[PDB]
Amino acid sequence: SCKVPFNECKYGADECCKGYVCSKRDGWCKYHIN
């Protein structure tokens, strides 16, 4: 019930796959830590 990290991401949206973080600047799902 989630989308790939390569795609976009909504600030706060937990829809993304657990384990990844959502960049506030880039506005996408990534693995790197903020």
Description:
The protein has a two-stranded antiparallel ribbon. With 34 residues, the protein is mostly loops. The chain has one domain. 12% of the residues are buried. A hairpin with a 6-residue loop joins strand 1 and strand 2. It has strands at 21-22, 29-30. The chain contains no helices and two strands. This is Jingzhaotoxin F7-10.36. Keywords: Disulfide bond, Ion channel impairing toxin, Knottin, Secreted, Toxin. InterPro entries: Huwentoxin-1. It is found in: Secreted. Disulfide bonds join 2-17, 9-22, 16-29.
Layout: helices, strands, pairs:
Layout: E1 21-22, E2 29-30
What features would you highlight for this structure?
about 35 residues; little secondary structure; 2 strands; about 0% helix; globular; Jingzhaotoxin F7-10.36; disulfide bond; ion channel impairing toxin
Shape: globular
Q: Trace the largest sheet across and list its strands.
A: 1-2
Largest sheet, in brief, is: 2 strands, antiparallel
Q: What fraction of residues sit in β-strands?
A: 5-15%
End-to-end CA span:
24 Å
Q: Strand pairing plus helix content: what structural class?
A: little secondary structure
What's the count of strands?
2
- The DSSP helix count reads 0
In total, the number of domains comes to 1
Q: What would you report as the Rg, rounded to the nearest angstrom? A: 8 Å
Helix content: under 10%
Order of helices and strands: EE
Pfam family, one: Toxin_12
InterPro entries: Huwentoxin-1
Subcellular location: Secreted
Organism: Chilobrachys guangxiensis (Chinese earth tiger tarantula)
